[PDB]
């Protein structure tokens, strides 16, 4: 329980750190897929079995497939960007890094002073999530169907060739 | 057995990493990648919060979050394809004509 | 689930059925006239069915949704904004060589998200309504993606709104982690005895404030506004500036009304600083603007600052909700008329290569009635008496005086003077010297003339608007 | 302690299942050769050993002792990683199958969801193999194969959602306990056929299989690709028997025997479909995946829901 | 418990034996033996797969608890699937789901 949670969290953090600094797009997407697998393992540690199955099925299995498809389509190999490596020199990233560190330490200070009885880890099955999802949350389901419809219409309108 | 604070802090770490990757990168593709990182971190935080209370609501918000993430990734990659078609480069600093 | 709850849902159902019907009609044949007419028919039908929802009463249709006269007022504002957007879009879309029919589907789905935000009583419904007004706006801001400025505005708004959605979602997750309930009324319930200012609740609300203040063009989340307003299509600029701001501020109004953490002093001070900076910065940045789109973006920043001033006086005062309603009616009509004059002068769409500069100088000597409407809205956004914008300014000043918000009152006066400079510069440039023909362009001219007449009439005689805003009451 | 020997016995059962599945994939690559001979009025390989039984070992040795080759101006990690995905994804998808009472590797609460996870990860093998080869033809062929794979993976889950809807749980043992009277081939016949087409298509079998994306692969990596293909065939057939044909249930024979004959039956039908069917064109394949099969699965789930709510 | 931890051990051993078998297979392959612009239709198809996959997840969550949701759940899933098929018809009729024009 805790053991798998901590390795999967550490793997997700490490993989994200390799994602945001790497130059090759396919390699960065592979590290992002690894971080998604780790986040799914974290979900399975918490008892959110549906969330972990969805993190593999939907996030790693659909969205990252779309990113990988786009990168393969464009044949991105650092058009005067890998030759520059602007994001690697500290005079570029030293500002945003400490800005994100300040935001992180404020958020962590806010987190550190809350009630924590501990996560039980009892599995909340996908059947109960379905009962809630088609019980008290049916307007969310319908309007999410329209949300994905809007995204589909927008992405077809923009991503054509003519 | 697992603290709620540790899951929340892990989500915050991934969120600020995604924000850093969003800011420091000139290529639009890595900006979209950082956006995906931030929204996945937010969904993870919702899963942690829902699992702490023993409620389905965290996983439901996770489902809504990944629906949004799918839609935004679709739209952003369409816009990136349009940018690469029109200007033949993904430098986001060159898309800066409107100012003042 | 009761059938009376189904009666409370009619704007949502009618807009969704219009979405499905227009989509299937596009699938049958691509007809701009027929699909546009079906869209405006569905929006008009939902606006009419608001009367049946009013006869239905007021009830909590879900753990998610709650409908009262507050929600019907916001729904009516959003539907009127959408109808005006479609009316301005048809003479604009007449010149669009690509598919002209997806515009209306995105506009309708955005109106659906606005209706959800109008009726939202839950963090899930708030998040869903935010995303439902955001993603169609990604499509609409870059509907003319071949145009360089429209593609730039689309990329900017899409990236920044995805980032703000991440901030808002993370804040919602922290709030749910503290509270254990995504209902609005439980956000601070489990605290008590002076322990309202929990740090995680405050930080979650801060991240939500970042996302929503991006969505409301509040300083310092405001820099996107002139670029996105200038790059977007002019009916899209109208829809953004009216419908998105009105729906999101309505749901922020409701969130700060029923959340017990809305009475926190820290959030009040932060929102006061944001309102002060928004008023001053939006007025100061519009001083030397020759572009009417960027100028109206900075103006929207200032007007949302005035609205935030009305928001801060919620708990101390009693007329704050009425002030927000009257101000939002005046702002809706004023921005509708302003961006509508910009839209009809930017219509038909001339192509991705040709410039879309407004060139308002000398507008009277070739197009006089639209010049009159444009200067009437310039006076209204300046808050000059004989306009409903002044009535909203008077309400904001009344709630700032009653709640003793003297810094914000002084900010309103100073920003009003700076606004007088730039608004009067535009309004007198309309009458200086400079070096259509179908019935839909005439319908857009009718819409802006009607909005100008309404703002003038409710400037001289504001009592009907005050009475109908006071008619709206929430489920306290 | 009885707990320790029970744990070790379950681990031994899982390892036995894994070894038998890998051996079945390789031995039925050889069996595919023999069955293609039988279907084509010939014999196939019947000379290497008793009845050709050692031909597979000869293939394995030949690919083991071939010169290992990677293209020079090519990525190494992605190129090496693609055959690992093509093997591991469906080999791991087997872990939820109930073979007999008392013989299951993982009695997961998700089951079917774990299979969907494995297929979604399995598309990356084709994408990675196409990109890493530094060949335009192989890249274009892999993008074509990946688009086809997505076109059928989009309705694979719903084609199984009919069976899950009837059973009311994602668990596999409960699904095969819901077949004690009527197998789902009769009520979920649309679900049966759509899972058949989807399982053939995501495995890149005939008739679902710009040159190919395997031209730069050679040696033991080509062997990984092919053995992973046949292992996926074993897994898909076992899933099919578990979901639609009662799994272990039978009147007279022991349950493992019934499961084995039904799985062998569907693998024989897999090879027969390879032998008999002609290959349709690309656009026809994508249109049959999207236009026909996806609304068929949606309507099948709707009608299934209405029927089960009728009682 | 006992059976659940035995099955956890069996599943973990299944994972590590499969991964190690594949890696050992490639290691032995490397050891032994002696030496010597794509169209936007791909993006559109992958994007359609993503959108309909998320909508499929909603139907996955519906299908597990049919007899715990009553007829109201069937009705709501019916509007869901109607919008699904309306989007599918919209994509088919405009040429989005056609590889060739
Ligand atoms: C070994 C040292 C590190 C070596 C390098 C990293 C290797 C991968 C490490 C991460 C994945 C394995 C984590 C360890 C899992 C071991 C099994 C375990 O701890 O199971 C406990 C628990 C069982 O479930 P439960 O009923 O809750 O039991 C709790 C007590 N009764 O289990 C659960 O609740 C869930 C079990 C975990 C979730 C499923 C597996 C997720 C796999 C994620 C892979 C991520 C990508 C890896 C990339 C590697 C290269 C960087
Ligand atoms: C006696 C003290 C106690 C009583 C105080 C009473 C206060 C209210 C009444 C007095 C108000 C004084 C306002 C003074 C400025 C008036 C505006 C003006 O002169 O505008 C002209 C100028 C444009 O003309 P030009 O110089 O040609 O510039 C070319 C532009 N490119 O315009 C510009 O260059 C830009 C103008 C910007 C807008 C005007 C400035 C507003 C500043 C805030 C006003 C509110 C009062 C603040 C306190 C004032 C001092 C006490
Ligand atoms: C190249 C290498 C890539 C990475 C490979 C994997 C790395 C880690 C390897 C070690 C893993 C050890 C096993 C982990 C624990 C297994 C048992 C387990 O997860 O138990 C927890 C839970 C039990 O739930 P259940 O039994 O249903 O209910 C009763 C509750 N006591 O059951 C569950 O939650 C089951 C669901 C989770 C199962 C995950 C299995 C691995 C999935 C990742 C496969 C990666 C494939 C390769 C990469 C693809 C392309 C990128
Ligand atoms: C105070 C409320 C608004 C009052 C009306 C504002 C102006 C509206 C337009 C009326 C017609 C204007 C005609 C201007 C003619 C200018 C001629 C200049 C000759 C040198
Ligand atoms: C630039 C804007 C200046 C606004 C000045 C407002 C002055 C407010 C004074 C408040 C005094 C409160 C005393 C208690
Ligand atoms: C293609 C099928 C692959 C199956 C792999 C797993 C084989 C497991 C064998 C188990 C045998 C014993 C089953 C329990 C006893 C019932 C049968 C007794 C007579 C054999």
Residue D74 CB burial class (10 angstroms; 0-12, 13-18, ≥19) = middle
Give chain A positions within 8 Å (CB) of B4. Answer: 114, 116, 118-119
Among C165, C277, C177, CA closest to C222: C277
Resolution (Å units): 2.4
**What are the tokens at D293?**
């099969």
Distance CA E85, CA E70 (A): 23
Token pair recorded at residue B40:
């996945």
**By the 8 A CB rule, do D97 and D18 touch?**
no
Report the residue of C23, C109, C128 to disrupt the E interface, i.e. the one with the largest count of E CBs within 10 Å: C23
CA-nearest residue for atom 14, ligand 5, is C406
- What length does chain D have? 311
CB contact under 8 A, A142 and C202: no
Instruction: State the Cα angle at C419 between C415 and C424, rounded to 5°.
Output: 155
Question: What does the alpha-carbon distance between residue D272 and residue D196 come to, in Å, rounded to a whole number?
Answer: 13
Q: Does E85 touch chain C (CB under 8 A)?
A: no
Distance (Å, rounded) from C-alpha B26 to C-alpha B15?
A: 19
Residues C76-90 as b/e (b if ≥16 CB within 10 A, e otherwise) read bbbbbbbbbbbbbbb
Q: Tell if the CB–CB gap between A140 and C128 is shorter than 8 Å.
A: yes
Query: Nearest residue of A to residue C17 by CA position?
Result: A146
Q: Give the residue carrying structure tokens 């009304």.
A: C257
Among the listed residues A133, A115, A116, the one whose alpha carbon sits nearest the alpha carbon of residue A124: A133
Here the tokens at position C395 are 């309400």
In angstroms, what is the span from residue A41 Cα to ligand 3's centroid? 7
**Residue in the block written with tokens 């800066």:** B96
Q: Does C300 touch chain B (CB under 8 A)?
A: no
Q: Is the sign of the CA dihedral D147, D149, D155, D157 positive or negative? A: negative
Point out the residue among E51, E57, E58 whose CB comes nearest to the CB of B74: E51
CB of A124 less than 8 A from some CB of D? no
Ligand 3 atom at shortest distance from the alpha carbon of D108 = 27
Cβ of A156 and E44 within 8 Å? yes
**C98–A162: do the CB atoms touch at under 8 Å?**
yes
Residues of chain A with Cβ-Cβ distance to B23 below 8 Å are 96, 99-100
Quick count: other Cβ atoms within 10 Å of Cβ D16?
12
Residue A38, ligand 1, Cβ within 6 A: yes
Domain CATH for E93? 1.20.58.1610
Environment class of residue D131 by beta-carbon count within 10 Å: exposed (0-12), middle (13-18) or buried (19+)?
A: buried
CATH number of the B4-87 domain: 1.10.287.3510
Show the tokens assigned to D23.
């051996």
Verify whether the Cβ–Cβ distance A159 to E40 is below 8 Å. yes
Instruction: Look at A133 and E62 and tell me if their CB atoms are within 8 Å.
Output: yes
| Residue B97: how many other CB atoms lie within 10 Å | 11
| Minimal-distance CA residue to ligand 6 atom 7 | D17
Pocket test for ligand 1, best of A2, A3, A4 (most atoms within 8 A of CB): A4
Containing structural domain, residue E23: 10-100
Distance (Å) from the alpha carbon of A16 to chain E's nearest alpha carbon: 22
Chain C residues with CB-CB distance to A154 below 8 A: 106, 135-136, 138-139
Record the tokens describing residue D171, joined without a space: 């668990």
Task: Please indicate the experimental technique that yielded this structure.
Answer: cryo-EM
Name the residue of D104, D109, D119 to mutate for ligand 3: max ligand atoms within 8 A of Cβ. D109
Which tokens is C260 given?
A: 């017990």
> In whole angstroms, what is the distance from residue C218 CA to residue C303 CA?
10
**Rounded Cα gap, residues E85 and C352, in angstroms:** 34
Q: For residue E93, which residues of chain A lie inside 8 Å, CB to CB? A: none
Structural domain spans, chain B: 4-87
Q: Which residues of E touch D169 (CB under 8 A)?
A: 64
Distance D102 CA to ligand 6 centre (A): 10
CB-CB neighbors (< 8 A) of E97 in chain D? 286-287, 290-291
What residue numbers bound the domain in which C219 lies? 1-476
- Identify all chain A residues contacting E63, using CB atoms and an 8 Å cutoff: 130
Are residues E51 and B70, on separate chains, in Cβ contact within 8 Å?
Answer: yes
**How far apart are the CA of C222 and the centre of ligand 5, in A?**
24
Report which ligand 3 atom has the smallest distance to the Cα of E4.
Answer: 31
Is D212 touching E (CB cutoff 8 A)?
Answer: no
**Spatial separation of the C-alpha atoms in residues D119 and B53, rounded to whole Å:** 33
Would residue E49 count as lying in a domain?
yes
CA distances from D80 to D129, D130, D136, E29 (A): 9, 12, 19, 11
Spatial separation of the C-alpha atoms in residues B14 and B41, rounded to whole Å: 6
Burial of C192 (0-12, 13-18, 19+ CB in 10 A): exposed
Choose the closest CB to B70 out of E43, E54, E61: E54
How far apart (Å, rounded) are the C-alpha atoms in residues C339 and C335?
6
Name which of D229, D230, D95 is nearest D172 in CA terms: D95
* Helix orientation angle between C199-215 and C123-141, rounded to the nearest 10 degrees: 30
Q: What's the rounded Cα separation, in Å, for the pair C60 and D93?
A: 45
The finding on whether C417 has its CB within 6 A of some atom of ligand 2 is yes
Non-local CB neighbours of E10 within 8 Å, separated by 6+ positions:
D10, D11, D13, D14, D105, D106
Q: How far is CA A122 from CA A125, B13, B54, C177, C178, in A?
A: 9, 25, 8, 17, 20
* Residue in chain C nearest E90 by alpha carbon: C27
Query: What is each CA distance from D255 to C290, C434, D101, in whole angstroms?
Result: 83, 93, 8
C220 upstream amide cis, omega within 30 of 0: yes
Distance from C-alpha of A62 to C-alpha of A54, rounded to nearest angstrom: 10
Q: 3-state SS of chain D? A: CHHHHHHHHHHHHHHHHHHHHHHHHHHHHHHHHHHHHHHCCCCCCCCCCHHHCCHHHHHHHHHHCCCCCCCCCCCCHHHHHHHHHHHHHHHHHHHHCCCECCECCCCCCCCHHHHHHHHHHHHHHHHHHHHHCCCHHHHHHHHHHHHHHHHHHHHHHHHHHHHHHHHCCCCHHHHHHCCCCCCCCCCCHHHHHHHHHHHHHHCCCCCCCCCCCCCCCCCHHHHHHHHHHHHHHHHHHHHHHHHHCCCCCCCCCCHHHHHHHHHHHHHHHHHHHHHHCCCCCHHHHHHHHHHHHHHHHHHHHHHHHHHHHHC
Number of domains into which chain E is organized: 1
Contact C16 A154 (CB under 8 A): no
- Beta-ladder partners of B27: B91
Q: Locate tokens 């001289």: which residue? A: C460
Q: Is A39 in the pocket of ligand 1 (CB under 6 A)?
A: no
Question: Distance between CA atoms of D196 and D240, rounded to whole angstroms?
Answer: 8
Which chains are adjacent to chain D, needing at least 3 Cβ pairs under 8 Å?
A, E
Asked if the C-beta of E25 comes within 8 angstroms of chain A's C-beta atoms, the answer is no
Closest-CA residue to C29 (of C94, C99, C133, C83): C99
- Cα gap D10→E61, rounded to integer Å: 31
Cα C364 to ligand 2 centroid, rounded to whole Å: 28
Q: Whose CA is nearest to atom 1 of ligand 5?
A: C411
Q: Which residues contact D26 (CB under 8 A, 6 or more apart)?
A: D56, D60, D227, D230
Tell if the CB–CB gap between E47 and A152 is shorter than 8 Å: yes
Task: Provide the CA D267 distance to its chain's centre, in angstroms.
Answer: 10
Fold of A1-159: 1.20.120
Q: Is C195 exposed, middle or buried (0-12, 13-18, 19+ CB in 10 A)?
A: exposed
Which residues of C are less than 8 Å from A106 in CB distance? 203
- Nearest ligand, CA C411: 5
Q: Which of C391, C393, C458, C450 is nearest to C419 (CA)?
A: C393
Residue C88 in tokens: 């301005």
> Residue written as tokens 């499969």?
E18
Ligand 6 neighbours (beta carbon < 6 A): D 17, 20-21, 24, 99-100, 103, 234, 238, 254-256, 260, 263
Where helices occur in C142-223 by DSSP H, the ranges are 148-179, 199-215
Q: Which atom of ligand 3 is nearest to the CA of D124?
A: 50
* Ligand 5 pocket, residue C411 CB under 6 Å: yes
Query: Nearest 5°: CA angle at D182, between D178 and D184?
Result: 75
Q: Are A143 and B63 in contact (CB under 8 A)?
A: no
Among A153, E48, B39, smallest CA distance to C135 is for A153
**Maximum CA extent, chain D:** 65
- Omega of the bond leading into C150 within 30 degrees of 0 (cis): no
Total residue count of chain E as it appears in this document: 101
Counting Cβ atoms within 10 Å, is residue D70 exposed (0-12), middle (13-18) or buried (19+)? middle
> What are B14's two structure tokens?
């991934």
């Amino acid at each position: 329980m805790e053991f798998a949670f901590y390795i999967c969290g550490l793997i997700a953090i490490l993989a994200t750190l390799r994602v945001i600094t790497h130059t090759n797009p396919v390699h960065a997407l592979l590290y992002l897929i690894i971080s998604l697998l780790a986040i799914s393992g974290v979900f399975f540690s918490l008892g959110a079995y549906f969330a972990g199955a969805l993190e593999i099925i939907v996030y790693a299995g659909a969205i990252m497939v779309l990113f990988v498809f786009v990168v393969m389509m464009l044949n991105l190999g650092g058009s005067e960007i890998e030759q520059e490596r602007q994001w690697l020199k500290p005079q570029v990233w030293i500002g945003p890094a400490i800005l994100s560190a300040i935001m992180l330490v404020v958020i962590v200070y806010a987190i550190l002073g809350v009630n924590d009885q501990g996560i039980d880890g009892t599995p909340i099955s996908a059947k109960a999530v379905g009962i809630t999802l088609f019980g008290p949350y049916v307007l969310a389901v319908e309007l999410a169907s329209m949300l994905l419809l809007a995204g589909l219409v927008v992405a077809f309108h923009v991503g054509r060739e003519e | 057995m697992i603290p709620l604070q540790h899951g929340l802090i892990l989500a915050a770490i991934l969120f600020v990493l995604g924000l850093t990757g969003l800011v420091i990168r000139r290529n639009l593709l890595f900006m979209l990648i950082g956006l995906e990182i931030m929204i996945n971190a937010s969904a993870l935080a919702f899963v942690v919060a829902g699992s702490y209370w023993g409620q389905t609501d965290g996983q439901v918000m996770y489902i809504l979050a990944i629906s949004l993430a799918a839609a935004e990734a679709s739209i952003g990659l369409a816009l990136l394809l349009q940018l690469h078609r029109r200007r033949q480069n993904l430098n986001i600093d060159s898309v800066s004509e409107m100012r003042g | 689930i009761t059938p009376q709850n189904l009666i409370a849902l009619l704007p949502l159902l009618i807009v969704g059925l219009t979405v499905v019907v227009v989509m299937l009609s596009i699938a049958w044949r691509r007809n701009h006239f027929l699909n546009a007419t079906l869209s405006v028919i569905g929006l008009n039908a939902a606006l009419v069915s608001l009367w049946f929802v009013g006869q239905a009463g007021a009830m909590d249709v879900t753990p998610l949704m709650r409908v009262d006269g507050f929600a019907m007022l916001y729904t009516g504002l959003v539907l009127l904004a959408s109808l005006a957007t479609c009316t301005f879009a048809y003479p604009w879309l007449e010149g669009y060589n690509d598919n002209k029919d997806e515009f209306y589907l995105l506009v309708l789905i955005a109106a659906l998200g606005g209706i959800l935000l109008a009726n939202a009583n839950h963090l899930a419904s708030l998040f869903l309504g935010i995303e439902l007004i955001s993603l169609p706006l990604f499509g609409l801001v870059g509907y003319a993606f071949r145009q360089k400025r429209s593609l730039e505005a689309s990329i900017k708004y899409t990236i920044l709104s995805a980032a703000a959605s991440s901030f808002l979602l993370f804040g919602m997750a922290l709030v749910y982690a503290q509270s254990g309930d995504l209902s609005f009324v439980a956000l601070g319930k489990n605290l008590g005895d002076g322990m309202l200012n929990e740090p995680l609740l405050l930080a979650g609300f801060g991240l939500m404030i970042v996302g929503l203040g991006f969505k409301l063009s509040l300083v310092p989340f405001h820099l996107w506004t002139p670029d996105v307003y200038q790059g977007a299509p002019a009916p899209v600029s109208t829809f953004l500036a009216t419908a998105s701001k009105i729906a999101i501020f309505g749901v922020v109004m409701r969130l700060f009304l029923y959340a017990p953490v809305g009475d926190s002093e820290a959030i009040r001070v932060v929102l006061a600083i944001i309102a002060f900076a928004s008023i001053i910065f939006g007025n100061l940045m519009a001083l030397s603007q020759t572009n009417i789109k960027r100028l109206l973006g900075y103006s929207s920043i200032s007007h949302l600052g005035y609205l935030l001033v009305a928001l801060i006086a919620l708990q101390t005062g009693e007329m704050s909700m009425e002030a927000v309603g009257v101000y939002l009616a005046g702002y809706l009509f004023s921005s509708l008329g302003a961006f509508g004059v910009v839209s009809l002068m930017s219509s038909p769409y001339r192509g991705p290569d040709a410039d879309s500069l407004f060139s308002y100088r000398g507008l009277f000597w070739h197009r006089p009635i639209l010049a009159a409407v444009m200067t009437v809205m310039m006076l209204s956004l300046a808050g000059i008496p004989m306009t409903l914008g002044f009535i909203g300014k008077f309400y904001v000043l009344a709630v700032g005086v009653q709640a003793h918000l003297w810094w914000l009152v002084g900010a309103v006066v100073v920003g009003s003077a700076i606004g007088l400079y730039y608004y009067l510069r535009v309004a007198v440039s309309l009458y200086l010297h400079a070096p259509p023909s179908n019935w839909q362009y005439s319908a857009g001219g009718i819409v802006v003339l009607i909005s100008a007449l309404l703002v003038l009439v409710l400037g001289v005689w504001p009592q009907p608007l005050i009475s109908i805003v006071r008619l709206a009451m929430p489920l306290m | 302690s009885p707990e320790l020997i029970e744990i070790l016995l379950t681990i031994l059962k899982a390892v036995v299942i894994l070894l038998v599945v890998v051996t079945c994939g390789a031995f039925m690559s050889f069996g595919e050769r023999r069955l293609l001979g039988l279907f084509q009025n010939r014999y196939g390989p019947n000379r290497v050993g008793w009845g050709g039984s050692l031909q597979l070992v000869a293939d394995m040795i030949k690919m083991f002792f071939k010169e290992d080759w990677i293209p020079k101006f090519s990525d190494r990690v992605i190129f090496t990683l693609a055959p690992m995905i093509a093997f591991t994804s469906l080999l791991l998808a087997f872990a939820i199958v109930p073979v007999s009472p008392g013989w299951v590797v993982a009695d997961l609460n998700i089951g079917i969801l774990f299979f969907l996870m494995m297929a979604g990860l399995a598309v990356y093998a084709v994408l990675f193999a196409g990109w890493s080869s530094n060949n335009k033809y192989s890249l274009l062929g892999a993008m074509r194969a990946s688009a086809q794979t997505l076109s059928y993976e989009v309705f694979l889950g719903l084609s199984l959602m009919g069976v899950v809807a009837q059973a009311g749980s994602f668990n596999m043992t409960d699904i095969v306990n819901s077949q004690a009277h009527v197998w789902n081939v009769i009520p979920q016949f649309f679900g049966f056929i759509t899972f058949a087409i989807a399982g053939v298509a995501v495995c890149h079998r005939h008739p679902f299989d710009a040159d190919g994306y395997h031209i730069e692969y050679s040696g033991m990596k080509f062997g990984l690709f092919f053995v992973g293909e046949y292992i996926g065939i074993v897994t898909i057939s076992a899933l099919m028997v578990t979901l639609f044909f009662g799994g272990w249930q039978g009147p007279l024979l022991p349950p493992f025997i019934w499961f084995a004959l039904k799985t062998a039956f569907f693998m024989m039908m897999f090879i027969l479909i390879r032998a008999s069917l002609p290959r349709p064109r690309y656009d026809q394949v994508m249109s049959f995946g999207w236009k026909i099969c996806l609304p068929l699965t949606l309507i099948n789930l709707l009608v299934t829901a209405a029927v089960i709510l009728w009682q | 418990s006992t059976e659940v931890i035995a099955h956890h051990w069996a599943f973990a051993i299944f994972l590590i034996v499969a991964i190690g078998l594949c890696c050992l297979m490639l290691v032995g392959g490397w050891f032994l033996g002696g030496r010597a612009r794509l169209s936007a239709k791909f993006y559109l198809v992958a994007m359609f797969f993503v959108i309909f996959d998320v909508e499929a997840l909603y139907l996955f969550a519906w299908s597990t608890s049919i007899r715990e949701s009553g007829w109201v759940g069937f009705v709501e899933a019916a509007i869901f699937i109607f919008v699904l098929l309306a989007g599918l018809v919209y994509l088919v009729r405009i040429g989005a789901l056609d590889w060739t024009p």
